[PDB]
C-alpha cells in the first residue's frame, strides 16, 4: 500500500541526513572556513564602490572614444585640404600613381597609369592577419575599373592620407583600422593587408553600414511598388530583387514600409503604418515582396494618395525626418499633378522614381515626377545595375548636411557588427568628408554639394572589455552597456555570431544587434532600468530577480544590485551588476618572496600527486605571458615564468599573481591537512575545490581526466549556482553524450564556502563532491523498503513491478531512481519518462516553466526557444492522485532539505495508462516573436535628434533625366 506521511518523511530525512553529512564531512566547508580566518593578515578586504567603479569605467570608455574621434577629425581635415589642392589631370603616364591594390597576387612575376607595390608583411597578433605599416592598401571592387580617369585622380590625391595614417598610428599605437570610403567605390585602409580570401568579391564600401550612417540622416522611406499587369515577367523579378537590395541599405534608426498598387493600394505585409528597419521587420518585408504577383491596370493617383497618407501618420514612432518615397515601376503616361499639388505643395517629401526592366514604354512622366519634387531618376535594365542604382540615393540625401557646413561633422558610432577583415565584433566611428574645392573664393558651389566620402576608425569590443576589469568582481557580477536603441554594446551573453532572423529554410554582413531584454530574462524592473539607461540617467536599483544559469538548464533566484551611469559625451550608457556578497572582495598581500616560492612549489607538475590535478584559469598575468586553450601548456608557462626570473616582475599584474599564489597555498594546505588523511571514501568518487582566483584542484588522478569543467572559475556554471544558493546544490550529469556518463564520473554536488571577516560576508571558494552512482542507488534502495511491512512491497524494490521511486532536482532532471532502466537514464529530464506526471507537477505549481529565446544559435536545416524549470513554492510537501485518463495514481513528494532534491513516489503507468506527449526541456528551433504583433507595442528607443533634411540653397537641378 501507499506509505504513511510520517514514514515517507522519516525516509526522506534519513536520505537527507546521509547525503548532507557525507558532503559536509568529505568536502571541508568548515575546514576552508577555518583556514581562511586563521590565515588572515595575508590579505585585506576592500570595498566595491559601484558608483565609483561604473563612473571610472565610463570615463575610460569616453577617453578611448575621444582618442578614436580625434584621428577622424584630423583625417577629415587633411583629406578636405588635399582635395582642395588637387588638379584634375587627364593624361596619366603608365607610372604616375603608385599603390598596392590589396587584391593582386603577391607573386605575379610580370597598368594604364598605375604601378603596383610589392610590400612586406611580417605578422601582427593584434590583427591576426599579416600587415604592413609602410603604406596604405586600396580596395577597388570588381565592377569598377581601376584605370578610369575618375579612379586614377582619387588614387593620386588620397596618397597624402598615408602620412596622417602613420601619424595617428604612432600617436595611438592601439588603432586597428583607418578606412576612407570614397564616393567612387575605392577604400583606403592604413595597415596594408590583403583582401579577404568562387571567391568573387561583391564588397562595395558605399553600401557598408558605417558609410550609410555617415553619408546621410535617418530616413522615413515608403517603397511604392507597381504591381500592374505590364510589370509581369522579368520586370517583376528585377523589381523584387531591387526592393530587397534597397531594404538592405537601411539601419535601425530608419523606418520603412513597403506598399503596392495595381488599381487600389494596399500594404504588402502585415504592417500598416511604418516599422523600424530591424533585422526581422526587414525579413518580413522581403518575404512579402517576394510573394508579390502582378495583375491589374496602373492607377498612380491612388498609390501616391496612399503613400503620402502613410507618410502623415504620427500615432506611431518614426525618425520624423527625411520623408522619402520610392516608386518602382516601368513607365507610364500619367504624371498626376493634382496629387502632388494637393499633398506635397511646399515640397517636404522627396520622390525617387525607378524605371525597372527592359521595355519601350514612356519614361517621361516619372522623370518629371522626380524633377518637380526633390529627387533623382534611376534606370535598372539588368541585375548588374541594381546595386549601384539602389545605393546612389544617399548622394542625393547628403546635400542638406553638406550645405549645413561644419555642423554636420559629428562622429557617429555604428552598431556592433562583424568586421569585414575578420577582427570580430567592432564598432566604427564615421565622419563625413565634405567638398571644399574653391571654398575660400566664392566661385564654385555647384558640385560642392556632394560628399567626398566617409572616414572610419574601428575599435574592437576587446578594448572596451579591457577597460572594464571583472576579476575584482564576483563571477555573478558583470558589466553591460546600452545604446539608445536598447542594444547591448557589452554583455556576457553577446557572442560573435549573426543574429538569428527566423527558422532556417530547407535547401556576417548584417549587424549584430541584441536587445538588453533579449540577452537576459525579461522582468518588469529590467524594463524600467532599460528605459532609464536609454534616457541617460544615473541611478541605483536593488531587487529580487531570476537569473539563468550558464549551462542554461536551470533558473536560480538571487539578489542583484543594478548601478548605471551615462557615458557622458556618448549615446551609450554603462551599467554594473553586483550581487550582495560581491560588495566585498579579497585582495592579496605583498607578503614575501619566501611565501611566493612556497606557493609556487605547490602547483608544479611533479607535485600533482600530492596536491591533485591542478587547473589554472587562463587569465593574462603578464604581457609576454601567452594564454593557451590547453590548460597544461598555460600551467607549464606560468610555472616557468614564476620560477625562472621572479614571482613579481615589471609589465605584470601583481594583484592577479598574488591572488593566484595565495589561493594555491590555501588549496594545498587544505588538501594536505584534510583530504590526504582519508585516502578513499566509499561514498565519494572525488573531492574537488574551485576558488575565486582561477585555481581548481581535484584529489584523484582519474577524476582529473574525468573533469570536464572550464579551466576558468568564472565560466563554471556550478560555481555560480553555488554562489547564488545558501544550500547544497546538485548538478545533473549530461545524458546520451560523448563524454562519460554518471557511472565513471559520478554525480556532482557543490556547496559554497562562506567567510565572515569582521561583519562582512565573503564567498571566495566552492567545494564539490562526486557521488558514486552504485553507493547512492544501494543506499536509496535499502532505506526505502520495510522488510516486515507486508507481503506485497510497501516501497520500491530493485525492480518494483508497481511502485515507482524517483528523486529529482530543481531542474527536474533524474538523478536517482529505483528502476534499472531509469538508472540507465540518469541525467535525463524527467519528461520523456513520465510526461503526464511532470504536467501534473507543473499544474499544481511544483515547478515553474519560464521560456525565452536565444537569437544567436545555430541549427541543422536561427532562433531557438529554451525552457528552464525551477521550484516555485517553497512547500516541502505535496501529495495527491494523478486523476489519469479513467484512473488515478497516488504520489507524495518530499523535498530533501538543504540539498534541494525532491523525492516523489508514485504508481507505475501500468496501473493507470495516461497519454505521453513528452514535455521536452531542450531548445527547439522555434521562430521568435511574431513581428506583426510586436510592432503594435514597440519597445522604448531614443532616437537621434540631429537631422538635416532641407536647405533652401540646395540645387535640385540634378534630377537625372536631363543628364542621360
Ligand X SMILES: *[C@@H]1O[C@H](CO)[C@@H](O[C@@H]2O[C@H](CO)[C@@H](O)[C@H](O)[C@H]2NC(C)=O)[C@H](O)[C@H]1NC(C)=O
Ligand Y SMILES: *[C@@H]1O[C@H](CO)[C@@H](O[C@@H]2O[C@H](CO)[C@@H](O[C@@H]3O[C@H](CO)[C@@H](O)[C@H](O)[C@H]3NC(C)=O)[C@H](O)[C@H]2NC(C)=O)[C@H](O)[C@H]1NC(C)=O
Query: Strand, coil or helix: what is 647?
Result: coil
Name which of 242, 222, 221 is nearest 231 in CA terms: 242
- Kindly tell me which of 65 and 250 has the beta carbon lying closer to ligand X: 65
Query: Which residues contribute to the site for ligand X (CB under 6 A)?
Result: 55, 58-59, 313, 315, 546, 565, 568, 848, 850-851, 872
Distance CA 451, CA 463 (A): 31
CA distance linking residue 62 with residue 84, whole number of Å: 33
Q: How far is the CB of 374 from Ca ion (least distance, A)?
A: 26
User: Contacts with ligand NAG in 62-81 (CB under 6 A)?
Assistant: 63-64, 67
Under the criterion CB under 6 A, does residue 437 sit at the interface with ligand Y? no
- The entry of ligand NAG, Ca ion, ligand X, none near residue 58 (CB within 5 to 8 angstroms by kind) is ligand X
Beta bridge partners of 695: 616, 691
Annotation-wise, does 228 bind a ligand? Answer: yes
- By beta-carbon proximity to ligand X, the closer residue of 361 and 543 is 543
What is the DSSP-derived secondary structure letter of residue 734? P
Q: Indicate whether 144 belongs to the interface with ligand Y (CB under 6 A).
A: no
Q: Is 60 in the site for ligand NAG (CB under 6 A)?
A: yes
- Least Å from the CB of residue 228 to Ca ion: 4
How many residues line the site for ligand Y (CB under 6 A)?
A: 7
577 by Cβ neighbours in 10 Å (0-12 / 13-18 / 19+) ranks as buried
| Helical spans, DSSP H, in 347-504 | 365-372, 384-391, 393-397, 399-404, 461-466
Binding partner of residue 228 among ligand X, ligand NAG, Ca ion, none, CB cut-off 5 to 8 Å per kind:
Ca ion
Which of ligand X, ligand NAG, ligand Y, none binds 160 (CB below 5-8 Å, type-dependent)? ligand Y
How far apart CA 393 and CA 501 sit, in angstroms, is: 27
Part in contact with ligand NAG (CB under 6 A); list of ranges 57-65, 529-537, 587-595, 611-619:
57-65
Q: Is 244 annotated among the ligand-binding residues?
A: no
The answer for residues whose C-beta is within 8 angstroms of residue 822's C-beta and 6 or more apart is: 806, 814, 833
Three-state DSSP class for 794? coil
Residue facing ligand Y at closest CB distance = 156
Instruction: Select the binding partner of residue 848 from ligand NAG, ligand X, ligand Y, none (C-beta < 5 to 8 A, by kind).
Output: ligand X
Minimum CB separation from Ca ion for residue 330, in Å? 7
Least Å distance, CB 265 to Ca ion, is 15
Cα atoms in the Cβ-side hemisphere of radius 13 Å centred on 22: 24
Give the torsion through C-alpha atoms of 721, 726, 727, 730, to 10 deg.
0
317 annotated as a binding-site residue: no
Instruction: Give the separation between CA 487 and CA 481, rounded to whole angstroms.
Output: 8
Residue 63 interacts, among ligand NAG, ligand Y, ligand X, none and using kind-specific CB cut-offs from 5 to 8 Å, with ligand NAG
The footprint of Ca ion (CB under 5 A) covers 228, 230, 298
**Residue 67: CB partners within 8 Å, gap ≥ 6?**
172
CB of 692 to ligand Y, least distance (A): 58
Residue 568 interacts with which of ligand X, ligand NAG, Ca ion, none, CB < 5 to 8 Å by class: ligand X
67 binds, among ligand NAG, ligand X, ligand Y, none (CB under 5 to 8 A by kind): ligand NAG
Length of the chain: 964
Round to whole Å and give the CA distance between 286 and 903: 52
Q: Please tell me whether residue 85 adopts helix, strand or coil conformation.
A: helix
∠ at Cα 630 (627, 634), nearest 5°? 45
H-state helical runs in 766-916:
773-784, 820-824, 835-843
Report the C-alpha dihedral over residues 631, 636, 637, 643, rounded to 10 degrees. 140
Upper half-sphere CA count for residue 790 (Cβ side, 13 Å): 8
Size of the site for ligand NAG (CB under 6 A): 6
What residue is closest to ligand NAG based on CB? 67
* 40-48, 56-64, 446-454, 630-638 -> range binding ligand NAG (CB under 6 A): 56-64
Tell me which residue of 486, 498, 901 sits closest to 893, measured CA to CA.
Answer: 901
Cβ 577 vs Cβ 477: under 8 Å = yes
Nearer to ligand X, 59 or 283 (CB): 59
Q: Which does 850 bind (CB under 5 to 8 A by kind): ligand X, Ca ion, ligand NAG, none?
A: ligand X
- Which of 169/302 has CB closer to ligand NAG? 169
Helix/strand/coil for 210: helix
The burial of 200, by beta-carbon neighbours within 10 Å (0-12 exposed, 13-18 middle, 19 or more buried), is given as: exposed
Which residues between 149 and 178 bind ligand Y (CB under 6 A)?
156-157, 159-160
Give me the 149-188 binding string for ligand NAG, x by CB under 6 A, dash otherwise.
Answer: ----------------------xx----------------
**What residues between 81 and 110 interact with ligand Y by CB under 6 A?**
82, 86, 96
Q: Of 68 and 751, which CB lies nearer to ligand NAG in the complex structure? A: 68
SS3 content of the chain, % helix, strand, coil (to 5): 30, 20, 50
Q: Provide the grid cell at 267.
A: 500594404
CB of residue 159 vs ligand Y: minimum separation in angstroms?
Answer: 5
Q: How far is the CB of 538 from ligand NAG (least distance, A)?
A: 21
Residue ranges for the known binding site for a divalent metal cation are 226, 228, 230
The contact set with ligand Y (CB under 6 A) reads 82, 86, 96, 156-157, 159-160
Residue ranges for the known binding site are 226, 228, 230
The contact set with ligand NAG (CB under 6 A) reads 60, 63-64, 67, 171-172
Amino acid at each position: 500500500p501507499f506509505p504513511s506521511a510520517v514514514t515517507i518523511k522519516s525516509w526522506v530525512d534519513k536520505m537527507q541526513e546521509d547525503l548532507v553529512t557525507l558532503a559536509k564531512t568529505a568536502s571541508g566547508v568548515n575546514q576552508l572556513v577555518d583556514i581562511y580566518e586563521k590565515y588572515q593578515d595575508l590579505y585585506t578586504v576592500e570595498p566595491n564602490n559601484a558608483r565609483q567603479l561604473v563612473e571610472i569605467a565610463a570615463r575610460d570608455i569616453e577617453k578611448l572614444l575621444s582618442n578614436r574621434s580625434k584621428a577622424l577629425v584630423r583625417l577629415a581635415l587633411e583629406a578636405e585640404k588635399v582635395q582642395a589642392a588637387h588638379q584634375w589631370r587627364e593624361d596619366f603616364a603608365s607610372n604616375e600613381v603608385v599603390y598596392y591594390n590589396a587584391k593582386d597576387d603577391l607573386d605575379p612575376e610580370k597598368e594604364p597609369g598605375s604601378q603596383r607595390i610589392k610590400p612586406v608583411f611580417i605578422e601582427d597578433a593584434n590583427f591576426g592577419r599579416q600587415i604592413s605599416y609602410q603604406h596604405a592598401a586600396v580596395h577597388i571592387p570588381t565592377d569598377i575599373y581601376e584605370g578610369s580617369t575618375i579612379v586614377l585622380n582619387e588614387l593620386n590625391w588620397t596618397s597624402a592620407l598615408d602620412e596622417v595614417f602613420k601619424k595617428n598610428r604612432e600617436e595611438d599605437p592601439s588603432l586597428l583600422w583607418q578606412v576612407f570610403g570614397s564616393a567612387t567605390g575605392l577604400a583606403r585602409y592604413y595597415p596594408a593587408s590583403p583582401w579577404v580570401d568562387n571567391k568573387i568579391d561583391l564588397y562595395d564600401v558605399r553600401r557598408r553600414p558605417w558609410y550609410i550612417q555617415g553619408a546621410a540622416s535617418p530616413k522615413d522611406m515608403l517603397i511604392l511598388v507597381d504591381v500592374s499587369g505590364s510589370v509581369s515577367g522579368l520586370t517583376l523579378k528585377l523589381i523584387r530583387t531591387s526592393v530587397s537590395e534597397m531594404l538592405e541599405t537601411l539601419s535601425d534608426d530608419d523606418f520603412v514600409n513597403v506598399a503596392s498598387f495595381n488599381s487600389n493600394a494596399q500594404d504588402v505585409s502585415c504592417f500598416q503604418h511604418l516599422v523600424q528597419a530591424n533585422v526581422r521587420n526587414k525579413k518580413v518585408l522581403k518575404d512579402a515582396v517576394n510573394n508579390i504577383t502582378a495583375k491589374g491596370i496602373t492607377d498612380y493617383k491612388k498609390g501616391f494618395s496612399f503613400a503620402f497618407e502613410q507618410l502623415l501618420n504620427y500615432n506611431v514612432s518614426r525618425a520624423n525626418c527625411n520623408k522619402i518615397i520610392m516608386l518602382f515601376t516601368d513607365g507610364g503616361e500619367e504624371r498626376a499633378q493634382e496629387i502632388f499639388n494637393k499633398y506635397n505643395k511646399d515640397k517636404k517629401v522627396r520622390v525617387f522614381t525607378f524605371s525597372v526592366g527592359q521595355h519601350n514604354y514612356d519614361r517621361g512622366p516619372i522623370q518629371w515626377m522626380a524633377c518637380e519634387n526633390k529627387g533623382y531618376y534611376y534606370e535598372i535594365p539588368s541585375i548588374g545595375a541594381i546595386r549601384i542604382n539602389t545605393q546612389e540615393y544617399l548622394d542625393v540625401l547628403g546635400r542638406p548636411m553638406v550645405l549645413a557646413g561644419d555642423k554636420a561633422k559629428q562622429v557617429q558610432w555604428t552598431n556592433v557588427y562583424l568586421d569585414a577583415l575578420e577582427l570580430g565584433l567592432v564598432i566604427t566611428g564615421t565622419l563625413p568628408v565634405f567638398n571644399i574645392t574653391g571654398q575660400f573664393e566664392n566661385k564654385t558651389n555647384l558640385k560642392n554639394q556632394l560628399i567626398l566620402g566617409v572616414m572610419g576608425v574601428d575599435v574592437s569590443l576587446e578594448d572596451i572589455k579591457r577597460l572594464t576589469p571583472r576579476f575584482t568582481l564576483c563571477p555573478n557580477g558583470y558589466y553591460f552597456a546600452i545604446d539608445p536603441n536598447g542594444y547591448v554594446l557589452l554583455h556576457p551573453n553577446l557572442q560573435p555570431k549573426p543574429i538569428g532572423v527566423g527558422i532556417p529554410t530547407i535547401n556576417s554582413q548584417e549587424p549584430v544587434t541584441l536587445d538588453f531584454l533579449d540577452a537576459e530574462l525579461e522582468n518588469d524592473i529590467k524594463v524600467e532600468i532599460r528605459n532609464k539607461m536609454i534616457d541617460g540617467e544615473s541611478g541605483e536599483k536593488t531587487f529580487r530577480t531570476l537569473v539563468k544559469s550558464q549551462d542554461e538548464r536551470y533558473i536560480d533566484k538571487g539578489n542583484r544590485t543594478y548601478t548605471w551611469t551615462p557615458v557622458n559625451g556618448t549615446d551609450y550608457s554603462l551599467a554594473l551588476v553586483l550581487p550582495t556578497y560581491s560588495f566585498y572582495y579579497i585582495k592579496a598581500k605583498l607578503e614575501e618572496t619566501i611565501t611566493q616560492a612556497r606557493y609556487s612549489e605547490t602547483l608544479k607538475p611533479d607535485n600533482f600527486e600530492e596536491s591533485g590535478y591542478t587547473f589554472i584559469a587562463p587569465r593574462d598575468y603578464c604581457n609576454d605571458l601567452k594564454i593557451s586553450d590547453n590548460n597544461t601548456e598555460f600551467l607549464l608557462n606560468f610555472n616557468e615564468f614564476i620560477d625562472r626570473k621572479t614571482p613579481n616582475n615589471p609589465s605584470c599584474n601583481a594583484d592577479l599573481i598574488n591572488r593566484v599564489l595565495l589561493d594555491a597555498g590555501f588549496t594545498n594546505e587544505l588538501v594536505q591537512n584534510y583530504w590526504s588523511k582519508q585516502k578513499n571514501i566509499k561514498g565519494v568518487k572525488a573531492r574537488f575545490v574551485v576558488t575565486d582566483g582561477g585555481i581548481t584542484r581535484v584529489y584523484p588522478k582519474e577524476a582529473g581526466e574525468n573533469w570536464q569543467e572550464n579551466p576558468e572559475t568564472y565560466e563554471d556554471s556550478f560555481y555560480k549556482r553555488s554562489l547564488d544558493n545558501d544550500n547544497y546544490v546538485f548538478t545533473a550529469p549530461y545524458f546520451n553524450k560523448s563524454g562519460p556518463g554518471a557511472y565513471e564520473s559520478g554525480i556532482m554536488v557543490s556547496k559554497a564556502v562562506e567567510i565572515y571577516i569582521q561583519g562582512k560576508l565573503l564567498k571566495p571558494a566552492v567545494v564539490g563532491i562526486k557521488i558514486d552512482v552504485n553507493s547512492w542507488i544501494e543506499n536509496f534502495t535499502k532505506t526505502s523498503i520495510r522488510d516486515p511491512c507486508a507481503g506485497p512491497v510497501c516501497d520500491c524494490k530493485r525492480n518494483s513491478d508497481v511502485m515507482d521511486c524517483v528523486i529529482l532536482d530543481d531542474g527536474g532532471f533524474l538523478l536517482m531512481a529505483n528502476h534499472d532502466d531509469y538508472t540507465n537514464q540518469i541525467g535525463r529530464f524527467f519528461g520523456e519518462i513520465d510526461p503526464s506526471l511532470m504536467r501534473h507537477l507543473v499544474n499544481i505549481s511544483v515547478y515553474a516553466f519560464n521560456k525565452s529565446y536565444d537569437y544567436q544559435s545555430v541549427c541543422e536545416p536561427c532562433i531557438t526557444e529554451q525552457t528552464q524549470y525551477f521550484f516555485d513554492n517553497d512547500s516541502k510537501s505535496f501529495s495527491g492522485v494523478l486523476d489519469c485518463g479513467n484512473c488515478s495514481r497516488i504520489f507524495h513528494g518530499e523535498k530533501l532539505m538543504n540539498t534541494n532534491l525532491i523525492f516523489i513516489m508514485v504508481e507505475s503507468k501500468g496501473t493507470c495508462p495516461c497519454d505521453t506527449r513528452l514535455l521536452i526541456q531542450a531548445e527547439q528551433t522555434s521562430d521568435g516573436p511574431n513581428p506583426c504583433d510586436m510592432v503594435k507595442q514597440p519597445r522604448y528607443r531614443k532616437g537621434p535628434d540631429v537631422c538635416f533634411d532641407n536647405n533652401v540653397l540646395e540645387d535640385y537641378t540634378d534630377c537625372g533625366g536631363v543628364s542621360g
